[PDB]
Amino acid sequence: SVYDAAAQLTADVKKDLRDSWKVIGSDKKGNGVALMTTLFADNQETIGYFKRLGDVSQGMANDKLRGHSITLMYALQNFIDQLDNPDDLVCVVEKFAVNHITKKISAAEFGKINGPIKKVLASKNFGDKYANAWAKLVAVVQAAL
Amino acid sequence: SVYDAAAQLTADVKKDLRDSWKVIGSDKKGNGVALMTTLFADNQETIGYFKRLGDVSQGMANDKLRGHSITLMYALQNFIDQLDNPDDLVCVVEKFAVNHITKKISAAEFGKINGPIKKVLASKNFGDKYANAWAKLVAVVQAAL
Ligand code: HEM
Numbered sequence: 001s002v003y004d005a006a007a008q009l010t011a012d013v014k015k016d017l018r019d020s021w022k023v024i025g026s027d028k029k030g031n032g033v034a035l036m037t038t039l040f041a042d043n044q045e046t047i048g049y050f051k052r053l054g055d056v057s058q059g060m061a062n063d064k065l066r067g068h069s070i071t072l073m074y075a076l077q078n079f080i081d082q083l084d085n086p087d088d089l090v091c092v093v094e095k096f097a098v099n100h101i102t103k104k105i106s107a108a109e110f111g112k113i114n115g116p117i118k119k120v121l122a123s124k125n126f127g128d129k130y131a132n133a134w135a136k137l138v139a140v141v142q143a144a145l
Numbered sequence: 146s147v148y149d150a151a152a153q154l155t156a157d158v159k160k161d162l163r164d165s166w167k168v169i170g171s172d173k174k175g176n177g178v179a180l181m182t183t184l185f186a187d188n189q190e191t192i193g194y195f196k197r198l199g200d201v202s203q204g205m206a207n208d209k210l211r212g213h214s215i216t217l218m219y220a221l222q223n224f225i226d227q228l229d230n231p232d233d234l235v236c237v238v239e240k241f242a243v244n245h246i247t248k249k250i251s252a253a254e255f256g257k258i259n260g261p262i263k264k265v266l267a268s269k270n271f272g273d274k275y276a277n278a279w280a281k282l283v284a285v286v287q288a289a290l
């Protein structure tokens with residue numbers, strides 16, 4: 001239940017999400033591409049889903065990948081801004097869930113983003129505490145897939 | 146090209162876009178839904194394109210419409226944040242252009258959003274000068290359609 005999952009975002013979890021987002025969200029292009037390249041490097045079996053982006057190994061040089069990556073960061077910005085109201089968080093999460101359901105992305109595969117998030121956070125000195133907080137947010141999307 | 150349309154956005158235009166967005170972008174749920182409902186009221190012929198959202202006459206109560214509207218405002222947030230780097234603005238604009246091209250939305254049809262934007266801007270007392278500035282930003286997207 002996406003609603004029960006949203007209920008797991010306690011005061012402490014929301015605080016850690018906001019605090020870390022303040023840093024990671026400051027460079028959407030840089031960290032956005034970092035997230036995607038890490039996903040492709042650690043889970044090569046997911047590259048096939050991104051055929052529209054062309055050669056993803058080009059990273060920042062790939063205009064389609066850069067556009068996609070920046071936009072992805074605004075989806076996270078959206079989630080963070082909706083933390084105050086569970087009803088609004090759920091409706092935006094379901095909107096993005098549909099985008100992935102159409103691309104045939106399951107809850108299990110969506111969860112493969114946790115590894116990359118932990119790595120990007122770690123490179124900014126945010127440890128497991130923050131990685132686990134973000135895993136709870138990702139879990140809300142997984143509940144809608 | 147799209148680059149040309151973006152590179153032509155002057156300092157004065159960017160100033161008006163940012164100043165007005167500070168206001169209309171401050172209430173994404175409220176102004177986002179207002180934009181969509183106004184589009185449906187003045188351009189009823191577009192209602193059919195949004196069948197995935199269900200009964201759009203339900204307004205704010207429609208969770209699918211609310212989720213869509215909030216997300217639309219983040220696409221605008223994206224554009225506004227990329228104003229000073231045409232290269233980044235272009236790649237994000239082309240990304241969203243693809244979303245509409247797949248939905249069979251022509252450049253002329255995309256331009257129908259100018260009416261709703263002008264009305265929402267006016268509701269906050271931003272006049273024709275601001276409506277003209279936004280029309281120039283919409284024109285960047287039209288260059289990709
Ligand atoms: C933090 C997690 C993630 C977020 C917030 C996110 C966000 C997004 C956004 C905003 C889009 C654009 C939707 C559109 O306009 O069609 C997108 C597209 C896509 N996402 Fe994700 N995504 C995430 C994780 C993943 C993962 C882990 C996979 C795959 C294992 C995945 C697969 C896809 C695919 C295949 C597309 C379509 C790309 C294209 O053809 O343009 N996403 N995602």
Ligand code: HEM
Pocket residue numbers: 099191194195196197198213216217220221241244245248250254255256257258
């Ligand atoms: C300020 C201008 C506009 C912006 C920034 C914008 C933004 C968006 C965004 C972000 C999406 C979601 C993309 C996706 O996840 O697939 C979307 C979907 C869509 N847009 Fe727009 N849009 C604008 C104007 C228009 C206009 C004027 C029309 C119609 C004449 C239109 C028709 C559509 C349609 C049919 C969809 C698909 C909705 C669905 O089935 O989920 N858009 N738009």
